[PDB]
Paper text:
[name] domains are protein interaction modules with critical roles in the assembly of protein complexes involved in autophagy, signaling, cell division, and redox processes, as well as the auxin-response pathway in plants. [name] domains form homotypic interactions via conserved electrostatic motifs molded by basic or acidic surface patches on opposite faces of their ubiquitin-like β-grasp fold. While type A and type B [name] domains can form heterodimeric protein complexes, type AB members can mediate interactions with either [name] domain type or engage in homotypic interactions to form homo-oligomers or hetero-oligomers. Our cryo-EM structures of filamentous p62 and [name]–[name] assemblies revealed that the presence of a tandem arginine sequence in the basic motif of type AB interfaces is required to stabilize a polymeric assembly.
Of the three [name] assemblies studied, AtNBR11–94 ([name]–[name]) and p621–122 (p62-[name]) formed homogeneous filaments of constant diameter that appeared best suited for high-resolution structure investigation by cryo-EM. Image classification of segmented [name] helices revealed that both [name]–[name] and p62-[name] polymerize in two different tubular morphologies: a projection class with a ladder-like pattern, we term L-type, and a projection class with a serpent-like one, we term S-type. By indexing the layer lines in the Fourier spectra of [name]–[name] filaments, we concluded that L-type is a two-stranded helix with a pitch of 77.2 Å and 11.47 subunits/turn, whereas S-type is a single double-stranded helix with a pitch of 68.2 Å and 11.55 subunits/turn. Using the derived symmetries, we determined the 3.5/3.9- (L-type, p62/[name]) and 4.0/4.4 Å- (S-type, p62/[name]) resolution structures. All four structures form tubules of ~120 Å and 150-Å width with an inner diameter of 45 Å and 70 Å for [name]–[name] and p62-[name], respectively. In the absence of prior structural information, we traced the [name]–[name] de novo. This de novo-built model is in close agreement with the 1.6-Å crystal structure of a polymerization-deficient [name]–[name] mutant, which we solved in parallel. The main interactions are formed between a double arginine finger formed by two neighboring arginine residues in strand β2 (R19–R20AtNBR1/R21–22p62) stabilizing strong salt bridges to acidic residues (D60/D62/D64/D73AtNBR1 or D69/D71/D73/E82p62) in the OPCA motif located in the β2–β3 loop and the α2 helix. These interactions are assisted by the canonical-type B lysine (K11AtNBR1 and K7p62) in strand β1. In addition to the canonical transverse interactions, the helices are further stabilized by longitudinal interactions Y14AtNBR1/N28AtNBR1 or K102p62/D92p62 and R59p62/D93p62 to subunits of neighboring strands along the helical axis.
Residue numbers in the entry: 5 to 92
């Protein structure tokens, strides 16, 4: 019945917000729902490209591209997700 704490950080200011999950177990948003949510925090122009890369369990710098890999963050069993923004 619990959320995933997501911390993002662009222009060297870390932020943090939470995202709930269903009863079923998947995250209750998608990338188009996510990337326009990040553009709210940072006052970025939404037409700009975002290059979002999270952290794996065993420390790789993975890419995010699709709602297929957002499913994987639940099964990855991470304590809090961290997503870096690279624009322009």
């Amino acid at each position: 019945a619990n959320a995933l704490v997501v911390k993002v950080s662009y222009g060297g200011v870390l932020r943090r917000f939470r995202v709930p999950v269903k009863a079923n177990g998947q995250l209750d948003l998608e990338m188009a729902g996510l990337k326009e949510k990040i553009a709210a925090l940072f006052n970025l122009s939404a037409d700009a490209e975002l290059s979002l890369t999270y952290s794996d369990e065993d420390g790789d710098v993975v890419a995010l591209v699709d709602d297929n890999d957002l499913f994987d963050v639940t099964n990855q069993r991470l304590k809090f997700l961290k997503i870096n923004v690279n624009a322009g």
